[PDB]
Amino acid sequence: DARNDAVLVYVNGQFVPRHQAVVSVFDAGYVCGDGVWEGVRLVDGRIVSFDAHIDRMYEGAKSIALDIGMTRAQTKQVVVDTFLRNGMRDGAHARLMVTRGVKKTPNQDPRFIIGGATVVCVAEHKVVTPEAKRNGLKLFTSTLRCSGPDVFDLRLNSHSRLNLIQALIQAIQAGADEALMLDPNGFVSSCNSTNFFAVRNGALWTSSGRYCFNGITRATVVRLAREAGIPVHEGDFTLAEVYAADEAFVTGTLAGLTPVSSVDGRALVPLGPLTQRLDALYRAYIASANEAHGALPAAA
Amino acid sequence: PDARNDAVLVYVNGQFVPRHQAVVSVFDAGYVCGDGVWEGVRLVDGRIVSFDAHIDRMYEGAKSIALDIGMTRAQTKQVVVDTFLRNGMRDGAHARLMVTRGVKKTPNQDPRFIIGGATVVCVAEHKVVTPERNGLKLFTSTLRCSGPDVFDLRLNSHSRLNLIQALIQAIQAGADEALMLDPNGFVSSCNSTNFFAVRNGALWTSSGRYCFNGITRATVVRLAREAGIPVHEGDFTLAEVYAADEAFVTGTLAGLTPVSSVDGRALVPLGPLTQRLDALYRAYIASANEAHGALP
Amino acid sequence: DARNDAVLVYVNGQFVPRHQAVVSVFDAGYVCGDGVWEGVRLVDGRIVSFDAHIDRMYEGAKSIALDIGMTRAQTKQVVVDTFLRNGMRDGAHARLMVTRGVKKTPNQDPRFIIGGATVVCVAEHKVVTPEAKRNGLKLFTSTLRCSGPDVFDLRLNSHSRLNLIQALIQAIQAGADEALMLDPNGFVSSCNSTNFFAVRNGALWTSSGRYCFNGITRATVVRLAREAGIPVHEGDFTLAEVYAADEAFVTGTLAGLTPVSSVDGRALVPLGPLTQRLDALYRAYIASANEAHGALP
Amino acid sequence: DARNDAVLVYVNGQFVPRHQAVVSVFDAGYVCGDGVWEGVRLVDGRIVSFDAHIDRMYEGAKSIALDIGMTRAQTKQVVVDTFLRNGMRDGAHARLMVTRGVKKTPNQDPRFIIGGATVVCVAEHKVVTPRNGLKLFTSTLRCSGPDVFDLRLNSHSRLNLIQALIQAIQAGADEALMLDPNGFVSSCNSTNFFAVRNGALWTSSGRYCFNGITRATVVRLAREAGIPVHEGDFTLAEVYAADEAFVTGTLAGLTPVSSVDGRALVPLGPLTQRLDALYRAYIASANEAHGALP
Amino acid sequence: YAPDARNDAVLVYVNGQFVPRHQAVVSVFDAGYVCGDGVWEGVRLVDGRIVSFDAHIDRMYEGAKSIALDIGMTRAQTKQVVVDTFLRNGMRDGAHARLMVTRGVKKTPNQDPRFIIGGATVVCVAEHKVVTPEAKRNGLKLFTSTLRCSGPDVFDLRLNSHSRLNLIQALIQAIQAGADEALMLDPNGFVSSCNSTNFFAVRNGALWTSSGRYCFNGITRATVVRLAREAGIPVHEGDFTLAEVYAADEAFVTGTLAGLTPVSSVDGRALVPLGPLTQRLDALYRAYIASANEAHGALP
Amino acid sequence: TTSSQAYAPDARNDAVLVYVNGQFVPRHQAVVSVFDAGYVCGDGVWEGVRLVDGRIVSFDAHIDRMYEGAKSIALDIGMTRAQTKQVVVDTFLRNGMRDGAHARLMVTRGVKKTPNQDPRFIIGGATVVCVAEHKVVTPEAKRNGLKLFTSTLRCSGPDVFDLRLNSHSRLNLIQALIQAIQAGADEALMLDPNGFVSSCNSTNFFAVRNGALWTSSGRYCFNGITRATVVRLAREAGIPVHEGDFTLAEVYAADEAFVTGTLAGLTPVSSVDGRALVPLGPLTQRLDALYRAYIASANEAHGALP
Ligand SMILES: Cc1ncc(COP(=O)(O)O)c(C=O)c1O
């Protein structure tokens, strides 16, 4: 989308063209991966599941003693302002990135910070029709594991992403699009950047999320499934259960439900019936005037 | 603390940029994802201490994450040299060379869609660490060093929340630095320095299977063996620490820092073996050893 | 409480003045930490949740093949007699301690015990100060872990307590009052001597208890919560979920619900609304003529 | 030995007849298993490897912030005095037990201690005969890693070991063998474990068990006699196919192992016999490791 | 199983042939013999009905899929193998069959699954096997082996395979402790299963069994759980300890071959065999397997 | 489509006689009861040995591993070591092999009264099978090098399954191989439970970094004869050997890697997880030459054919 060349990026309250959207080399985010972020989608004038995203950011920031320096409402207003300044109402997404701040000297220690969080919001136009993603993802189960929370709590949506990127790198070399990752016990946990679901015998299966990002999209699809009386098995399941699944798909804010066409070269039919049903339910939900979605105000 | 640091010029992608303007894109993999490797080096009496050892670690770490540095070792070395030269630094300085995957078309974790090359940044700063080192308080964090199938701590990367989180806990315990156990509960390392204990005239340190394998650590081990001090490199416990004669940490920035307590258990700071190894280390880094790259 | 100086302690069927209440240096409890115990609270003539305590003791004793050498009723009678001998009817607590017995030689081997189990009951006056009048515990999450049951089953309420004391020692040196402990997987398990609870958005959260003492108080508070329609999250939760909690508190027979004012230096407002509601429910429950509480004669 | 009925036990500086040797029910040792101990053997007027034992006690005490309240010399003197008071010169053993002390109220918290550490020393006669050999069963219960409970500590908290022993006894065995968290052979519940394979001694690294003085002695004697010792990770398979096995501890010395999990080994194999003779010679010698009685 | 002279003369299905017992053979190059490379099911024939037949076939198809083993038959055809093996032997009642499907004959003996001449080897051993209540009622002695159930990233014990040394090893240790069967803990130390049967305990009127994350998910196990819930017996399917076993009121094990077998001790800790809830569930199970339920495949 | 298990096709292999329980049986007729413990349960141990210039390479070492493995699973082989040796010798002799051959000796617990796991139910003694085949693995066939993928499936600790056992229960290894095959690789590399490099699914793994040979401790994999030989040859030639915990990072930055086993000797590795390594680097070539010299010598380790 050619219009992406002319977007303004929010950087510490300045609206800046992409080629000039910059942060100090001393920023905690650049030096140390020291920050938390959220991606949100804008559909028909509404930021999808906005509060759920902001809640995860406030929880993640709290866990790393990172002062966001704004109330929830103010942080929301950053995103709102970024969409308004770009004239975006629909078919957009934004990545809100909050890093500890600019450091007196590049090192890990958070006490060496000049106070004031770095706040960046990258808003962009995008789009993809439901059976145009007809291209299922190929998944490869990486040898690199999800961590337990005494090592690194994967509920944290952080700027420290090498633990996930490394699994993706391995999956790419296996000819896959995305890594599936096991938890420390060997049960299926999640993909490197999306949550993983299987369909077995009319039932929806996904991990407990004890060892992966608990995506807002994952949460929404679970809820939609239960509300529709689809049985949901949220708990420990294996690669054997995946290879024998009827369908599989991944979830995340950027693409919604993406069908999976194979796992470790084991074929699954992309876009099976239950994927189709849940996708329709999700598409309806994100387009509705549901109170979970924050209506973008008109400009002043 | 040194007023000259306010005016240093930072290497960014071949340009020397004043401190307050030295910037990287918000789309850079280092900012978005902590996706990069770095090395810190110390400049002593015109010589970059253990320069090659630092560069080899960077090349191996970059290789591990399929990050093309986009430079030969000689070129990379030249970046650091040039950064010191541009700042008129000959002694009492430290530099952090940071290499991140590069500028992405869109901010996300996927390494594939990189416009252009690796981002290369070098921050040099005057950093005199006086021996006048009252000894660190350590607290053993509840947060663990990972095994290499989760996150290989030999990597010196821009993804450091795994270490920072241990440090945060130690800070709230009233300590200066976190000590970290490995997945089996043996002593591994500190959050930003390697850890050593002294027991009965012997030097003890972890195997390094689960922590950064620091250059300083390696140097101190080597000096110890060359001086006929016994070195136990292997699994040891909190109990062995609490009953030690001495303890100290190692890193490029500070050299040997004495430890005055671990989990509130007092140790006499700067014991005899710490003092000897410190003298050996200061001698070594100030010598015309072939391990150190002379500035022009 | 000055009265505590003069209490009589039950020792093997005798009432013994406190300063003379003694056990052989050959006792399995002393040599080896080899025994199980229960703490019970006496409130308004009633031993709180007495049966629940006794059932834990019988299960724990069974797990280490320790024959208590008494029926459940008889064991209860020890505690009853200990309170009655000391003229206690309210405001008291007792520790019933049952160790394997006197050994022919001091070593770990449980065989070759002279006689039966050693039975000791220490009753003492404690005023439990009102809810409003304590400003909350500081917790530090120790580096020392709760064990899995193939290493040491923390459901066991035993005389072998260095595994818990070690975590407490570390927490004390961090400036805290009590240790929080993670399980082998890194999820929150319990404190070193009390069970741990968090409140997150009007909901009560506590571990599954797979890796800690399953306290009677814990079990009571879970049940009270559900009976009151407070949602209860019993399952795996993290330090992150604690640091972002609205409230936290710990449970045990000695103090009831004790509010938590911080965890690893992260402030929590002590005695938040859900702590206060559950405390009122618990204080009501332990003072009621519920059938779970054994009336003194 | 009938003489054991009349021994005097050291309790806090007093020598107390056996049947009156007592500790408060408020003692940290009784309430909580909160203390450290050492077993020592007296051979031909010498306390075997005395300093080594005391050093482990001081290290263990330090790990649990237990103040013994005595210098090393004083602690040694308690044991010396206990043997002297009982007229023991040979064929005796003592257990020195140091618990945190008397509590104001029975609970786990180490802070509320009236006075100093409780110090108890039980000395007893035992003749150690020149012996059927132990049956060992590998318990399902594991040695812990040091972030759960460090088995180098020789403490009064012993149910973690007793539980393994209980399972072994019900399997018809005399002693539990115990694996480490990774499934490698670690130790027995109360003695260190050795296997003999191909002229070589095999024992665990000791990362996950008590580091016994006897174990250390046997390793050294083996190397001085040119028997190699492989201290490392080894498996049940390597035990079941061993030529011999034995256990070590202060109480019995080298005890042969005659089976593990029902798999027969030699009732007393040649290298066990050699090392036992070397050990008996060593503990009877005027070595500087042994503290001569007055 | 009660001694039965008729078993000496049974015909075994081998690759479409009915072969007398003493001649029923497979190539030394077969993947099953060289490598334990195959999946199997045991089924019980009661009053002309193969008990829970589809459930067994479903497990076989999932297990074969997990190891990329093509059974080379439709489910109907697979069923017909079993049917034919019972019919050929004139069995209508009081019989059991083991259906074994191995990857096939190899070009050379090695582990590599690619080197297969021809299709899967299919063997069906049917035998008269009444396990009398006389024989069963007194109960098994269990010993908790030191050898543990694996997590699914090492070996998924839901697989019913020809690679059984991981189970046999536990059993060998139990046999030498004077026990009949090994009980096995999972990697975390919780009770998982026996070496060849699923394990249940009864505590205070409630049925306890493991979650099955670390053991074979037996058909009989699943049937007993369902009968318990249908009878309003509480079921605690979850993590429990040896302490909870040693203090249980009753214990029993389940499997196709013997049904519910009472446990008389675990690690030498006595349990009264055939307690009231074991007897109730046993009565419910015997009723169920003898009924015209649609889960059971009627012989023609 | 590549194995580390491939060798020159050899028409003579159609007609070999297989030892089965004391008989020599034509290949197509060489059979075992469907009640055999090996078929039902994977219940047996095996050894593969290579015949070079009339000498069975490292024969005693193979036999010792078999006897130890059989002991570990209480399997009575029912033959002395000399008898067992003689079975393999006789199998090579009966097929006229003196060179360029490999045998797999398979000993399973025996015929069961009923197919189940219980080892008590055994009629008679152990089943003994020996399959000898002409198997030349040329250096030409090897020069391309194997592609490794690090499987998600891991080597077990010995309290789950002791990988020093060379058993008929091989789905634990085959599963890792299946995953590697679908990644486009020839063989699976496997990590140990701690995440350190352990072994391949059917061969031992080595890396070369800076003139030094690196291989795992072997605490968590088959302790191959070939592996042990290569370690000793390296030490004897003064090449430093790092036997201990190393990582995927250490592999991806290696100068060379190769795998070892009886069937192929030293096979160079060309990539691990898509990370290229030059196949047949200088230290692989030196160790290969040392190994070929060693297996062709009259070393005391090799069993002379009569
Ligand atoms: C699993 C495994 N790895 C590697 C090898 C290679 O070892 P060797 O050199 O002894 O054939 C073997 C031998 O069978 C093996 O079984």
XYZ file of N, CA and C in Angstrom, chain A residues 201-300:
300
model
N -12.158 -33.433 15.665
C -13.434 -34.075 15.871
C -14.470 -33.063 16.354
N -14.596 -31.910 15.692
C -15.552 -30.866 16.008
C -15.107 -30.022 17.216
N -13.953 -30.323 17.833
C -13.563 -29.623 19.059
C -12.323 -28.751 18.787
N -12.279 -27.612 19.456
C -11.149 -26.694 19.377
C -10.149 -26.972 20.515
N -8.872 -27.168 20.158
C -7.793 -27.454 21.089
C -6.751 -26.345 20.991
N -6.293 -25.834 22.138
C -5.202 -24.892 22.223
C -4.486 -25.102 23.561
N -3.223 -24.681 23.698
C -2.517 -24.861 24.971
C -3.172 -24.027 26.084
N -2.765 -24.301 27.316
C -3.256 -23.547 28.494
C -2.724 -22.122 28.461
N -1.709 -21.860 27.640
C -1.041 -20.575 27.647
C -0.131 -20.327 28.842
N 0.183 -21.365 29.640
C 1.090 -21.201 30.781
C 2.470 -20.820 30.261
N 2.782 -21.156 29.011
C 4.117 -20.976 28.466
C 4.109 -20.280 27.107
N 3.189 -19.316 26.893
C 3.286 -18.512 25.678
C 2.535 -17.195 25.897
N 2.705 -16.245 24.945
C 1.891 -15.043 24.920
C 0.434 -15.501 24.977
N -0.346 -14.809 25.803
C -1.783 -15.066 25.837
C -2.454 -14.048 24.940
N -2.499 -14.340 23.639
C -2.940 -13.346 22.676
C -4.382 -12.916 22.898
N -4.696 -11.654 22.529
C -6.056 -11.191 22.668
C -6.892 -11.985 21.638
N -6.311 -12.188 20.426
C -7.024 -12.940 19.408
C -7.332 -14.369 19.891
N -6.323 -15.026 20.482
C -6.531 -16.347 21.083
C -7.732 -16.332 22.050
N -7.747 -15.347 22.972
C -8.757 -15.207 23.995
C -10.107 -15.037 23.321
N -10.176 -14.173 22.308
C -11.443 -13.906 21.652
C -11.951 -15.192 20.976
N -11.055 -15.966 20.335
C -11.515 -17.130 19.579
C -12.015 -18.233 20.534
N -11.322 -18.410 21.671
C -11.775 -19.290 22.729
C -13.208 -18.933 23.136
N -13.416 -17.657 23.455
C -14.731 -17.171 23.925
C -15.782 -17.380 22.839
N -15.471 -17.005 21.601
C -16.452 -17.168 20.533
C -16.839 -18.638 20.400
N -15.837 -19.532 20.498
C -16.077 -20.959 20.370
C -17.061 -21.452 21.445
N -16.807 -21.101 22.698
C -17.684 -21.514 23.822
C -19.086 -20.926 23.646
N -19.179 -19.664 23.228
C -20.463 -19.005 23.050
C -21.274 -19.665 21.946
N -20.592 -20.238 20.947
C -21.193 -20.954 19.836
C -21.413 -22.435 20.171
N -21.133 -22.863 21.432
C -21.244 -24.258 21.839
C -20.254 -25.195 21.131
N -19.154 -24.672 20.524
C -18.049 -25.532 20.114
C -17.284 -25.969 21.363
N -17.044 -27.278 21.611
C -16.188 -27.671 22.749
C -14.757 -27.149 22.568
N -14.184 -26.650 23.663
C -12.835 -26.124 23.694
C -12.026 -26.886 24.742
N -10.947 -27.504 24.240
C -9.971 -28.320 25.052
C -8.773 -27.330 25.189
N -8.600 -26.685 26.330
C -7.490 -25.781 26.583
C -6.610 -26.474 27.623
N -5.441 -26.950 27.239
C -4.710 -27.909 28.039
C -3.603 -28.592 27.237
N -3.006 -29.635 27.807
C -1.766 -30.146 27.269
C -2.104 -31.101 26.152
N -1.552 -30.787 24.979
C -1.710 -31.689 23.861
C -0.384 -31.818 23.116
N -0.297 -32.871 22.274
C 0.997 -33.268 21.737
C 1.039 -33.034 20.214
N 2.257 -33.098 19.664
C 2.430 -33.224 18.228
C 1.596 -34.358 17.620
N 1.491 -35.526 18.274
C 0.673 -36.623 17.715
C -0.759 -36.141 17.526
N -1.247 -35.349 18.493
C -2.633 -34.872 18.416
C -2.775 -33.850 17.284
N -1.681 -33.118 17.004
C -1.712 -32.146 15.911
C -1.677 -32.905 14.566
N -0.767 -33.899 14.431
C -0.599 -34.555 13.146
C -1.898 -35.266 12.748
N -2.712 -35.663 13.727
C -3.979 -36.364 13.497
C -5.140 -35.388 13.558
N -4.883 -34.084 13.636
C -5.964 -33.095 13.715
C -6.752 -33.051 12.399
N -7.976 -32.522 12.430
C -8.767 -32.265 11.244
C -8.343 -30.946 10.633
N -8.039 -29.944 11.472
C -7.685 -28.617 10.988
C -6.717 -28.001 11.999
N -5.987 -26.965 11.555
C -5.248 -26.151 12.504
C -5.216 -24.715 11.980
N -5.007 -23.767 12.898
C -4.876 -22.381 12.491
C -4.150 -21.632 13.605
N -3.688 -20.428 13.259
C -2.980 -19.597 14.188
C -3.777 -18.302 14.289
N -3.565 -17.599 15.427
C -4.270 -16.361 15.670
C -3.262 -15.282 16.048
N -3.633 -14.060 15.678
C -2.927 -12.889 16.139
C -3.608 -11.631 15.615
N -3.250 -10.486 16.154
C -3.964 -9.246 15.782
C -3.724 -8.876 14.324
N -2.578 -9.243 13.767
C -2.287 -8.653 12.472
C -3.082 -9.333 11.361
N -3.215 -10.673 11.369
C -3.897 -11.377 10.296
C -5.210 -12.067 10.769
N -5.570 -12.035 12.059
C -6.784 -12.737 12.486
C -6.510 -14.247 12.635
N -7.352 -15.052 11.998
C -7.193 -16.486 11.871
C -6.476 -16.828 10.570
N -5.270 -17.399 10.677
C -4.596 -17.920 9.495
C -4.612 -19.458 9.521
N -5.177 -20.119 8.475
C -5.149 -21.583 8.390
C -3.728 -22.136 8.311
N -3.566 -23.360 8.824
C -2.289 -24.042 8.783
C -2.421 -25.173 7.786
N -1.431 -25.334 6.886
C -1.583 -26.394 5.872
C -0.670 -27.576 6.173
N 0.322 -27.397 7.042
C 1.107 -28.559 7.483
C 1.880 -28.216 8.756
N 2.210 -29.284 9.504
C 3.041 -29.160 10.689
C 4.079 -30.246 10.578
N 5.360 -29.851 10.539
C 6.464 -30.790 10.344
C 6.219 -31.647 9.103
N 5.664 -31.047 8.022
C 5.404 -31.754 6.764
C 4.187 -32.703 6.827
N 3.456 -32.684 7.936
C 2.222 -33.508 8.020
C 1.068 -32.655 7.495
N 0.432 -33.052 6.389
C -0.565 -32.200 5.716
C -1.825 -32.063 6.578
N -2.363 -30.845 6.572
C -3.723 -30.581 7.070
C -4.445 -29.791 5.993
N -5.717 -30.076 5.779
C -6.465 -29.304 4.789
C -6.576 -27.865 5.320
N -6.089 -26.842 4.581
C -6.248 -25.444 5.002
C -7.727 -25.015 4.956
N -8.203 -24.222 5.926
C -9.547 -23.662 5.961
C -10.629 -24.756 6.019
N -10.498 -25.667 6.969
C -11.564 -26.584 7.294
C -12.799 -25.876 7.857
N -13.886 -26.646 8.048
C -15.192 -26.061 8.366
C -15.168 -25.249 9.662
N -14.467 -25.764 10.700
C -14.498 -25.081 11.998
C -13.624 -23.833 11.990
N -12.504 -23.870 11.229
C -11.744 -22.639 10.992
C -12.657 -21.589 10.332
N -13.451 -22.003 9.332
C -14.303 -21.103 8.548
C -15.345 -20.452 9.458
N -15.921 -21.272 10.359
C -16.997 -20.827 11.232
C -16.442 -19.782 12.215
N -15.264 -20.072 12.778
C -14.690 -19.256 13.822
C -14.174 -17.961 13.203
N -13.619 -18.060 11.995
C -13.211 -16.886 11.250
C -14.400 -15.948 10.996
N -15.542 -16.505 10.609
C -16.739 -15.705 10.342
C -17.169 -15.034 11.648
N -17.163 -15.799 12.752
C -17.505 -15.260 14.059
C -16.529 -14.163 14.471
N -15.239 -14.345 14.175
C -14.258 -13.350 14.536
C -14.422 -12.096 13.691
N -14.651 -12.244 12.383
C -14.797 -11.122 11.448
C -16.008 -10.272 11.848
N -17.108 -10.956 12.231
C -18.335 -10.318 12.686
C -18.043 -9.550 13.966
N -17.334 -10.196 14.911
C -17.090 -9.626 16.212
C -16.253 -8.359 16.093
N -15.207 -8.380 15.262
C -14.323 -7.232 15.235
C -14.967 -6.076 14.478
N -15.971 -6.363 13.646
C -16.708 -5.352 12.887
C -17.947 -4.835 13.629
N -18.296 -5.391 14.808
C -19.532 -5.025 15.493
C -19.264 -3.835 16.421
N -20.343 -3.206 16.885
C -20.270 -2.119 17.850
C -20.150 -2.621 19.299
N -19.536 -3.768 19.492
C -19.110 -4.274 20.790
C -18.327 -3.268 21.630
N -18.611 -3.338 22.945
C -18.044 -2.367 23.864
C -16.552 -2.643 24.126
N -16.053 -3.852 23.789
C -14.632 -4.184 23.908
C -13.768 -3.347 22.927
N -14.395 -2.765 21.876
C -13.687 -1.998 20.856
C -13.880 -0.508 21.071
N -12.751 0.226 21.133
C -12.754 1.647 21.414
C -12.933 2.395 20.095
N -14.114 3.019 19.965
C -14.506 3.964 18.928
C -13.497 5.133 18.910
N -13.039 5.377 17.684
C -12.083 6.467 17.429
C -12.920 7.736 17.407
N -12.595 8.761 18.208
C -13.331 9.997 18.143
C -13.133 10.700 16.802
N -14.056 11.592 16.461
C -13.853 12.408 15.249
C -12.811 13.468 15.601
N -12.138 14.029 14.603
C -11.060 14.992 14.913
C -11.618 16.338 15.382
N -10.904 17.009 16.283
C -11.296 18.322 16.842
C -10.827 19.510 15.941
